Amino acid sequence: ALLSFERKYRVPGGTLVGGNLFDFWVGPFYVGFFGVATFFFAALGIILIAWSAVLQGTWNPQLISVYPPALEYGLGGAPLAKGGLWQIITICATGAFVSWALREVEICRKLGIGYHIPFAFAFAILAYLTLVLFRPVMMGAWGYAFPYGIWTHLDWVSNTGYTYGNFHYNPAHMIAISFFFTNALALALHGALVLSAANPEKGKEMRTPDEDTFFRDLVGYSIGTLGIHRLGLLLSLSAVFFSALCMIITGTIWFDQWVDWWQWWVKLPWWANIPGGING
Amino acid sequence: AEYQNIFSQVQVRGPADLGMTEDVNLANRSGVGPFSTLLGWFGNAQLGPIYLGSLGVLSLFSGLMWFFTIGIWFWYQAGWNPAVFLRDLFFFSLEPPAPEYGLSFAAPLKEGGLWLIASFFMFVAVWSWWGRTYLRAQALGMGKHTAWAFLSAIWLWMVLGFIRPILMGSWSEAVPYGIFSHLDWTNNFSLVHGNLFYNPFHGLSIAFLYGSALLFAMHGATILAVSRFGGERELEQIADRGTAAERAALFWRWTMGFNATMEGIHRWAIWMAVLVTLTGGIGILLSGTVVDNWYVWGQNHG
Amino acid sequence: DLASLAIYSFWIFLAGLIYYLQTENMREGYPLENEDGTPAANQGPFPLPKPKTFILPHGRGTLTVPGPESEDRPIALARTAVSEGFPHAPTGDPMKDGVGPASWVARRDLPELDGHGHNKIKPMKAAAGFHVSAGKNPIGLPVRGCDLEIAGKVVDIWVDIPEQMARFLEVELKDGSTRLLPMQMVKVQSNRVHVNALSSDLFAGIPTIKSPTEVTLLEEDKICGYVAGGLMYAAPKRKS
Ligand code: BCL
Ligand code: BCL
Ligand code: BCL
Ligand code: BCL
Ligand SMILES: CC[C@H]1c2cc3[nH]c4c(c3C)C(=O)[C@H](C(=O)OC)c4c3nc(cc4[nH]c(cc(n2)[C@@H]1C)c(C(C)=O)c4C)[C@@H](C)[C@@H]3CCC(=O)OC/C=C(\C)CCC[C@H](C)CCC[C@H](C)CCCC(C)C
Ligand SMILES: CC[C@H]1c2cc3[nH]c4c(c3C)C(=O)[C@H](C(=O)OC)c4c3nc(cc4[nH]c(cc(n2)[C@@H]1C)c(C(C)=O)c4C)[C@@H](C)[C@@H]3CCC(=O)OC/C=C(\C)CCC[C@H](C)CCC[C@H](C)CCCC(C)C
Ligand SMILES: COC(C)(C)C/C=C/C(C)=C/C=C/C(C)=C/C=C/C(C)=C/C=C\C=C(C)\C=C\C=C(/C)CC/C=C(\C)CCC=C(C)C
Ligand SMILES: COC1=C(OC)C(=O)C(C/C=C(/C)CCC=C(C)C)=C(C)C1=O
Ligand SMILES: CCCCCCCCCCCC[N+](C)(C)[O-]
Ligand SMILES: CCCCCCCCCCCC[N+](C)(C)[O-]
Ligand SMILES: CCCCCCCCCCCC[N+](C)(C)[O-]
Ligand SMILES: CCCCCCCCCCCC[N+](C)(C)[O-]
Ligand SMILES: CCCCCCCCCCCC[N+](C)(C)[O-]
Ligand SMILES: CCCCCCCCCCCC[N+](C)(C)[O-]
Ligand SMILES: CCCCCCCCCCCC[N+](C)(C)[O-]
Ligand SMILES: [Fe+3]
Numbered sequence: 001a002l003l004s005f006e007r008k009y010r011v012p013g014g015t016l017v018g019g020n021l022f023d024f025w026v027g028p029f030y031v032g033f034f035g036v037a038t039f040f041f042a043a044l045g046i047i048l049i050a051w052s053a054v055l056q057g058t059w060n061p062q063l064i065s066v067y068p069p070a071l072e073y074g075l076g077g078a079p080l081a082k083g084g085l086w087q088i089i090t091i092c093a094t095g096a097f098v099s100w101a102l103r104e105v106e107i108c109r110k111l112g113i114g115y116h117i118p119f120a121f122a123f124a125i126l127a128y129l130t131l132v133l134f135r136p137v138m139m140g141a142w143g144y145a146f147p148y149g150i151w152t153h154l155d156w157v158s159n160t161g162y163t164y165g166n167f168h169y170n171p172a173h174m175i176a177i178s179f180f181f182t183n184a185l186a187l188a189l190h191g192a193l194v195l196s197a198a199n200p201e202k203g204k205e206m207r208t209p210d211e212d213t214f215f216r217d218l219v220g221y222s223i224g225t226l227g228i229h230r231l232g233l234l235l236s237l238s239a240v241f242f243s244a245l246c247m248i249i250t251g252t253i254w255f256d257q258w259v260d261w262w263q264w265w266v267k268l269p270w271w272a273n274i275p276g277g278i279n280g
Numbered sequence: 281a282e283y284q285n286i287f288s289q290v291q292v293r294g295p296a297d298l299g300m301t302e303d304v305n306l307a308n309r310s311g312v313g314p315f316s317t318l319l320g321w322f323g324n325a326q327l328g329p330i331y332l333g334s335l336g337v338l339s340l341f342s343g344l345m346w347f348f349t350i351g352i353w354f355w356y357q358a359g360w361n362p363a364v365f366l367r368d369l370f371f372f373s374l375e376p377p378a379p380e381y382g383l384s385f386a387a388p389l390k391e392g393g394l395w396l397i398a399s400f401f402m403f404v405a406v407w408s409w410w411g412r413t414y415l416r417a418q419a420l421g422m423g424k425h426t427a428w429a430f431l432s433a434i435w436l437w438m439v440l441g442f443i444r445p446i447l448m449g450s451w452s453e454a455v456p457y458g459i460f461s462h463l464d465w466t467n468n469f470s471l472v473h474g475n476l477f478y479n480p481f482h483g484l485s486i487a488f489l490y491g492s493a494l495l496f497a498m499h500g501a502t503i504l505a506v507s508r509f510g511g512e513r514e515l516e517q518i519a520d521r522g523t524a525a526e527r528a529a530l531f532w533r534w535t536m537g538f539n540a541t542m543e544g545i546h547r548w549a550i551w552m553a554v555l556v557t558l559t560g561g562i563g564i565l566l567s568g569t570v571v572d573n574w575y576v577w578g579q580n581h582g
Numbered sequence: 583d584l585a586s587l588a589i590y591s592f593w594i595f596l597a598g599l600i601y602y603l604q605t606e607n608m609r610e611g612y613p614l615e616n617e618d619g620t621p622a623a624n625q626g627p628f629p630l631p632k633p634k635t636f637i638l639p640h641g642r643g644t645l646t647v648p649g650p651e652s653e654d655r656p657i658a659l660a661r662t663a664v665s666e667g668f669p670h671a672p673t674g675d676p677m678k679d680g681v682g683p684a685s686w687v688a689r690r691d692l693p694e695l696d697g698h699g700h701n702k703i704k705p706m707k708a709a710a711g712f713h714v715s716a717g718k719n720p721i722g723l724p725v726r727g728c729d730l731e732i733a734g735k736v737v738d739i740w741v742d743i744p745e746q747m748a749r750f751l752e753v754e755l756k757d758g759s760t761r762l763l764p765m766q767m768v769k770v771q772s773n774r775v776h777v778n779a780l781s782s783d784l785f786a787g788i789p790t791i792k793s794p795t796e797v798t799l800l801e802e803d804k805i806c807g808y809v810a811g812g813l814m815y816a817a818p819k820r821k822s
Contacts, residue, residue, distance in 0.1 A: 001622050001666060003533060003611035004651035005526050007659060011682035012669035013814050025667045030534035107534050111527045112683025112810035114284070114505035120497045154477045168463040184492040184553050188432070190499075191550030192425035198518050198543055198636065199423045205639040206519060207422055210697030210744045212324070213299035214426075217416045220313065220330030224745055226512045227323030230286060233500030236493040262370070271367040276359035278371035281769070282778060289770045290748045292706065292741050293715035300697050317716045324746070325715065480589045508766040509806040510749075516694050519638055519645050521610055522803050523687045529611065544607030551599060562588060570584045582586035 001027060014109030016102060030110075034103035038096055045092030049148070052085040065149025068142040075141060083142065090132050090145075097125045120233065123240045130244040138252050164250060169258035172246030179239030186235055190228050285507050287321045297326055304419045308333040331416065339408040346401035350374050350457045353394055373458030374398055376451045383450055398457060399441060410434060425550060432554035436561040447569045474573030481563030482574075488556040495552045499545060502528050517542040605631040609647040617666065640699045642692070654688040657681060677787060677808060677815050684811025689799035696744045701796050703749050705738045708795055712741050720770045725753050725763070728812075728820035731782035734761070736775055740797070750797075750805075751775060753785070761788040762797065762805050779812035781819035 002010075015023055017033040024031055053064045068090075069076075069083030078084045104118035132145040146156040161167035168174070193214065197207040215222035223231060254261060266272065266279045274280055283289065296312040313327030354372040358365040365372075376399075377384075377392030387393050414427040445453040455465050469476075476482040503511045509524035511517065517525045521542065529539040540548060571577045605628050612630055614622040636645045658679035659670035672681055680686045694702040706712050706721075714721075720736045727733045733753070737760060740750040750762040769776040780788075789804035791797050797805075 001624075002615045002617060003529065003539075004613075004615055005521075005611055005653065005687070006530060006533075006615075007617060007619075007670060008653070008657050008681050008685045009527070009530055009683075010670050011659065011672060011676065012662070013682070020669075023669055024663075025534065027667075028533045028537045104531075104535060107531055108505070109814065110534075110683070111531055112813055113527050113531060114508065116284070116501035116505040117498065117531065120501040123497075124494075158475070158477060166463065166467045168467060169460075180489055180493060183496055184489060184556050185433075187492045187496045187549050188429040188553035189426065190496075191546045191548075191553060192429040194514055194546040195543075195550060196417055196423035196425040197515055198546075199425070200421050201418075201423065203637075204421045205637040206515065207420070208300075208515060208639070208697040208744070209513070210297075210300050211515075212297065212744070213304075213697075214416055214420055214422060216299060216329060217304065217309070217331040217420070218413060218426075220310075220328050221324070223323035224747070225514065226285070226507065226745075226747065229500045229503035229507075229512055230322055231500070232496035233286075233504060236497040236500070239493050240497075266367055268367075271363045274361060274364055274367070276361050277357060277364040277368040279368050280364060283766065283769050285766050288747065289717055289765075290714055290720060290739070291716035292712055292739065292746055292748055294709060294712035294741075294743065294746055297744070297746065315715075320716060326746070481592075484592070508764050508810055510802060513694065516799070519636055520689045520799060521687060522689050522799065523685050523807050525610075526685075526687060538604075540607045541610050544603065544609065547603055547606055551603065559592070562592070566585050566588065577585060582583050 009111060011110070014106055014111075016106050016109075030103065030107050032103050032106045034099045034106060037099035038103060041092050041095035041099055045089050045096060048085055048089050048092065052081075052089075055081050055085070062150055065147050065152040067147040067149075067152070068136075068145045071141050071143040073142065075137065078142075086145075086148065087142065089148065094125075094129065094133075097121075097128065101125065116233070120237060123237050127240050127244045130248055135247060135251065138248075144251065160250075164255075165257035165259050167258060169262060170246050170250060170254075171258075171261065172242050172249065173258075176239055176242030176246050179235055179242060183232065183235035183239055186228065186232050190232060193228075285504050291317060291320045291325060293325060298329065300420065302420045304331070305333070308336075335408050335412050335415065339405050339412060342401050342408065343405035346398050346405055349394065349398035349401060353398075353457075370459035371461075373456045373461035375456045375461070376445075376454045379450050379452040381451070383446060387451075392451065395454075395457070396451065399454075403442070406434060406437065429550055429554050432557045436557040436564070439561040439565045444565055444567075444569065447565070453568070469567070473567050473571075474575035474577070476563070476567075476574060478574035478578040479563050479567070479571075480578075481559045481566065484559040485556055485563060488552055488559065491552045492556060495549060499549060502531065505531070514542055514546070601628070604628050609634070611651065612648060613651075617661065617670070639697075640695055642690070642695075655680075677784070677811050680804065680807055680811075682811060683814045684807050686800075686803035686807035689803055691798045691800040693796045693798050700743070702744060703740050703742055703797055705752060705795055706741050707738050709741055709743055712743070712746070714739070718770050718772060720751055720768075720775050723770070723773070723775045725751070725768075725775045725777060725785075727780050727782035727785065728778045728816060728822065729781035729783070730821065733777070733780075733782035733785040755785055757786075759790070760794070761785060762791065762801075763788070764806055764809055767809050777809075778820070778822065779809050779816065781812075781816050783819075784812060784816060 012020060012023055015032055022032045022036055049066060052066045053059060058064055066086045066089060067083065068086045069078035073083060077087060101118040101121045104121060105115060108115050136142050136144045146153045193211060197211050200207050209225050212222040293315060309331050310329040312329055315325040316327065317325060319325055353374045355365055357372045358368060374395050376395040377387035381387040381392060385396060410427060410430055413430050414424060417424055417426060441454050445451050455462055506524045506528045509522060511524035511528060525542040533539040608628060608630055614625055616622050630648045633646050633648060638644055658673045659681055660673050662668050662671045672679060676682045677684050696702050721738060723736050724732050725734045725736060734755045735753065736751050737754045738752040739748050740752060740762060741747065742749050748765045750764055751768055752760045753763055754760050763777060767777065767779050788808055789801065791801045
């Protein structure tokens, strides 16, 4: 139940609420106040979903789906079987996520480390809260949010997307996708760099950060080892920031076909009317 | 406000780092480039040296040849007018031969020959660059991970532009060179195939793509949190675990009940990432060669 | 059909891969232990991988993992409960004893070496010719602890030669000796360097180093450990 180096770290302290009340582990898992909060929220949430599954008439995980209040409920409550359960599961989900980040903060304090992880996690939570809370409230209805279901959530992705034609033309979506792809590239390369240093050619010794060499050799730059960890962090957080930007604005500041937004550049007076080319 | 190690508070510079000799042929290294105090708040300040060499040049020239083949066609499409070029920049497109020419190399420049030419320059630029990633590792005594991983990206690119067109019977199946045109191609591909959301491979690709954002957020953030114990010095932590590696592992063991090693984490990384384009490429390669409609296929689960 | 074959194979391969990755990540801190040090009964479904041997450069030997796991140091902690899973109370001073957020590991008592076999981290004064290239130069600034008292002054910057970056502030105490403070644990302001982890009186207690122009992995860990532990253990005297 303990890693060979673990015991020296399992000291008391660091909790945010409760002093020493929930200061303990269960197996490898740290508990804490927010470990308890997490359990209560995640458990309720699951129970409510299983209930909503009974009300829907299925136990298939490929079919079980919990849709929000239909569009005509606005931002009020809806009968439990008609989007009320979603409303409560969403309160549960949010409770579980925030609790989990706060439990992460608590671990950080015990371990005397930096708060970077729960900070990073907060961006994902914010993406979620954009889709299920922020956008709906700004749009006037819960029914704009995605439903909880393996394939039904995907239907919502497609139908929301095609409401604005090819969603490719959302400018923020483009920036976001760029970060996603770039970040995957940085992951591939960081992973492969470190491994090629630690796992050199048969019989040779382990190489070193001097790695900088390989990359300079390859592209004339190297960001360094503090740098790449700063990069991955920035890249992936930035992808999620733009992800949320690109949807916070859609259905609110921009609601027509995203392709048409690009006309502002073509229609600029200096060239709007010159003939030739695709738009002349 | 505690210091977060996102940006440095003090830069320090010393002699241009010329790097490790090992088996590199130093005749082929440039000398250093400038030093960017700007870059330096985030990463290294030194630019260069780079390593030229035969394959390098082939790649570099060949790549420009591709970039220029597309740009000529764009100016042409603008009827040579600068202000039009600038205006319609994301609208120009170098399109592949029409379905009629099949896989023949005998289509007119103005409708495909130019695409094929540009594609030819691309093919040599990428493969020579691949071989470059392998050889720069070789010369340094290093493992071949970067070249293996690059092969994973290459796979998707080969499938889209080359393997799939061939299997399908024509170059018209391939992707055009344009900013907007490529997105349209992308949309239309999904539409014409029953919606990729029904391709288990597309969906895997997504899981990995997202997973990479999740993994690197996690990794990056972790190293940063344990960098006050020298965390970022990952290789020495591999050879001699420090309280950095330990607090790192224990954060995750206490959070989610398991954890990595300072080397294992990097194997998680390389695979999360490579699997994006791996699944991805299978997903595309199958499309139209074997499955016309991912919705339909999905209905018979097979 | 061919797509069905392919997706079914992939899921197989992916189970294989999770296995390979999970076991690869079991090359340290395993086998699992009880709170008393002895092999825990339940190890879980993953077996340890076959050993692997890293050749360390500069004749520093090899590392072979998995291998026998010991702390190689006393752990000044004791149980606070009659059953598994509770906190272990520090038996002495946790700062001094190096437990908790003060923990250090017992790494090699040599310095990490660059790719040329030279010491990775020198004081700047002894690295030719390294200088502050941007941002406020801390050398000369008073160092303030979290009790808002002066604890010393910055006399140099220890720098990573191959990566050209600041790693520690060498700080001089009332009695003329120095300490290393990690770069990542100080705030260079304009009239001061601020050290939130430690109150002023806790500075003498920072682990010293044996030769004044180098630092060992062992020493680094003790310094870093000690300074981090301050955040938990100095909290009584802080304040901001
Ligand atoms: C994945 C399935 C589709 C795909 C659909 C998507 C979608 C959706 C999007 C992109 C977008 C990107 N795609 Mg695409 N695209 C694919 C094919 C590729 C291929 C290729 C196979 O060779 C290339 C070069 C590109 C390149 C482009 C870039 C313009 C853009 C960012 C790439 C990136 O973040 O890379 C990683 C970053 C790097 C560091 C390396 C690459 C550097 C880039 C910037 C330069 C390559 C293109 C360059 C010639 C453009 C400059 C021309 C003008 C002078 C401005 N795509 C396939 C066919 N692509 C996004 C965009 O914003 O477009 C407007 C976008 O929203
Ligand atoms: C046909 C459909 C349209 C389209 C529809 C739209 C729509 C609609 C959306 C996107 C959004 C996404 N699209 Mg799109 N877009 C399409 C084309 C693409 C293409 C492509 C190559 O063609 C790409 C790469 C992308 C990529 C992008 C991303 C920027 C973004 C998704 C990442 C994200 O927001 O995560 C952010 C992360 C999260 C929200 C996850 C949060 C998870 C945490 C907080 C909780 C999980 C814990 C718990 C539940 C786990 C269970 C416990 C177990 C123990 C594990 N799109 C096509 C053209 N796109 C989405 C977006 O930007 O949303 C903000 C979005 O709504
Ligand atoms: C982000 C933009 C869109 C959307 C875009 C799409 C698209 C497009 C796809 C998915 C797909 C996935 N989505 Mg989605 N997705 C949405 C946001 C969510 C949220 C959320 C905000 O809470 C969750 C939990 C999921 C999770 C799901 C997974 C079932 C699947 C793979 C995820 C993954 O590899 O992540 C990466 C992270 C990890 C590897 C961590 C693993 C965590 C996963 C496996 C946990 C899943 C839990 C699931 C069974 C929910 C049960 C809850 C429990 C009862 C508590 N999506 C929003 C609305 N999603 C893919 C799919 O194929 O689905 C059919 C896919 O193609
Ligand atoms: C509306 C359109 C369809 C769409 C259909 C498409 C199609 C078509 C494809 C994808 C592909 C994918 N889709 Mg989709 N996609 C859908 C919307 C989704 C959504 C969503 C709804 O949120 C998401 C997250 C995604 C997710 C993504 C990615 C996971 C995946 C490609 C990964 C990649 O890294 O490619 C980027 C990486 C590359 C293309 C390889 C790079 C190659 C190298 C060699 C580049 C050379 C560069 C050099 C020559 C240029 C130098 C420039 C420099 C500046 C020097 N799709 C909808 C349903 N999607 C691809 C896939 O894998 O599908 C299975 C694909 O073909
Ligand atoms: C910010 C950039 C990226 C990122 C980072 C990130 N994710 C994070 C954190 C960070 C740093 C971690 O610390 C944290 C973690 O614990 O690591 C495993 C985590 C985490 N991100 C996770 C998932 C996740 N992250 C996402 C991705 C991203 N996370 C971004 C790409 C997504 C994507 C891309 O789709 C998903 C699927 C978990 C593995 C973990 C959070 C675990 C957690 O909060 O648990 C607490 C509560 C439970 C155990 C379950 C609660 C159950 C609910 C009450 C009911 C379910 C409701 C739900 C709305 C239904 C959804 C149904 C679907 C079909 C749509
Ligand atoms: C695992 C999946 C991810 C991935 C990984 C990956 N990509 C790879 C590799 C890896 C492992 C690297 O080895 C390799 C690399 O060398 O990166 C540093 C690479 C690479 N991925 C690249 C692109 C790329 N990969 C893609 C991303 C992805 N690859 C996935 C997300 C993307 C997307 C999302 O479309 C982009 C576009 C390159 C940075 C590099 C491949 C290099 C190459 O093939 O280029 C050869 C040809 C040229 C040099 C053409 C130059 C044309 C320019 C537009 C001209 C301007 C610059 C000029 C060079 C200046 C010269 C001036 C002179 C006048 C003197
Ligand atoms: C300012 O003006 C100048 C002229 C100086 C410069 C400017 C030029 C400009 C503006 C050019 C811009 C270029 C653009 C927009 C290119 C980007 C297009 C995109 C988005 C490319 C993405 C898709 C690429 C794919 C997937 C294609 C893959 C290609 C292959 C796999 C190779 C194909 C192999 C073939 C067909 C050759 C067959 C021959 C043999 C036998 C090997
Ligand atoms: C293995 O990790 C990687 C680094 O290698 C050590 C890099 O440094 C970079 C490239 C970084 C940037 C921002 C270049 C910008 C600077 C210039 C040349 C003007 C990437 C993507 C990377 O993945
Ligand atoms: C709201 C979404 C529904 C939750 C489904 C429960 C999680 C099970 C994971 C999917 C695996 C399906 N299964 C067990 C049939 O193979
Ligand atoms: C290679 C690392 C540099 C990041 C490149 C990412 C390409 C996408 C361009 C987005 C830039 C937009 N931004 C954030 C400056 O506004
Ligand atoms: C993909 C990242 C792009 C990196 C490009 C950096 C090139 C550095 C050029 C060094 C050569 C400069 N010079 C002429 C002084 O030798
Ligand atoms: C991808 C590299 C881009 C680098 C740009 C970063 C500039 C940030 C400057 C931070 C400010 C430093 N300061 C003054 C607080 O010390
Ligand atoms: C590096 C391994 C991490 C594992 C990631 C796997 C997540 C599973 C997501 C299910 C995808 C479902 N489907 C039908 C699209 O294939
Ligand atoms: C893709 C999601 C899979 C859900 C299973 C959760 C994985 C967490 C790791 C389990 C830890 C094992 N432990 C310590 C409880 O025995
Ligand atoms: C895609 C990620 C897969 C998550 C589960 C992988 C490992 C589960 C936890 C392993 C058990 C940990 N243990 C018992 C060795 O400590
Ligand atoms: Fe790393």
